[PDB]
Symmetry: C2
Subunit: 217 residues, 2 copies
């Protein structure tokens, strides 16, 4: 049976939603600072309506669980939980560092990505990812670190790995840097949707009442 | 007869309430040091207890603040998600109003100056008077130094009552009520009362317009 998955991300100034239905992906993306709580659900209604898909057809709901903006992530968490509780469908928490990695893979073809997202207080969120059967997969663990301490799990002098995310604003303070980077790249629900597909096929998914594997500071 | 679901988490406590067939049911609990909000399982437990399906709910009421930032954000998101999935209206209700309605229920006070401890040595402030069973706002709500709060009534004309954690600042306030309860928190049961008035007036809005007050 083919899965129907709904994906949304509000971790940044970007708000985006994506839908998998009958093996087709559909997404929409807007930059709208501070207007997430008012614009997220209409984006969802429009996406479902454009696809001709009813909310009841959705098998699971995926969202970016951060790291990123405090308010944006918290909005996603609540809305997804509410949606999922009412439908009685599971939720899929997905890292925004992974989403960045998957996006950089899709757009640049980079199979090794060091994702870095600006954190508060002179630190960055940091996670390195490598392609594994179409999925950008975490090598090691994610961390929040002074830029001086970030490290990659592969040979640094190799010219094939790519730097993605606003954390790369701190590149001049890092102990290594890639040949190429994009410090303005943001999460995109389309790539969240890709990651949710892999996670859903592994049998992941949590019910709304269940303790959420999202750990905000 | 309406079926109304009420959610309040504006504090370090959590409560839910259901109006069904003219009968009200509520549950209230404090949230321990290392535990997170128990909102959705409390909702589940409430509905199961009342023998009511979530799909039978006509509208969802919530405390829209003021109060805590986090408690507001994720819980208001939950209200949005539920209401959207169910295709049902939401009823935004002031936590100051909820305090007033609760003080009325628990003390019979028909004039309540509600005060909630706000950040940076200030209180959230709003005065309410009873109007046909419902505590209605007199004047405006504000965030204010304790030294600058005022009541809209003639304080000498009738007794009024102090409700909420803002009244921990009472000795810094220009005036003082005959009685106060500084430990009083919002409660879903009294939110449910207010929601009913609001619903019977036909005041519901769509899920995307469920916003916190700030």
């Amino acid at each position: 049976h083919m899965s129907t998955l709904l994906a949304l991300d509000t971790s940044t100034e970007a708000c985006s939603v994506a839908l998998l239905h009958e093996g087709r992906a559909l997404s929409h993306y807007e930059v709208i600072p501070r207007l997430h709580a008012q614009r997220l659900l209409p984006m969802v209604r429009d996406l479902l309506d454009e696809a001709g898909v009813a909310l009841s057809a959705v098998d699971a709901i995926a969202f970016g669980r951060g790291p990123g903006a405090f308010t944006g992530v918290r909005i996603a968490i609540g809305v997804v939980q509410g949606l999922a509780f009412a439908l009685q469908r599971p939720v899929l928490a997905v890292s925004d560092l992974a989403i960045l990695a998957q996006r950089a893979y899709r757009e640049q073809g980079a199979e090794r990505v060091a994702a870095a997202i600006d954190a508060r207080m002179d630190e960055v969120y940091w996670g390195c990812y490598q392609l594994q059967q179409g999925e950008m997969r975490l090598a090691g663990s994610e961390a929040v670190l002074p830029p001086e301490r970030v490290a990659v799990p592969w040979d640094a002098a190799a010219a094939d790995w790519f730097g993605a995310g606003t954390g790369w604003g701190y590149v001049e303070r890092m102990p290594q840097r890639p040949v190429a980077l994009d410090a303005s790249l943001l999460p995109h629900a389309e790539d969240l949707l890709s990651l949710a597909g892999f996670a859903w096929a592994r049998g992941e998914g949590v019910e709304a009442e269940q303790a959420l594997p999202v750990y905000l500071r």
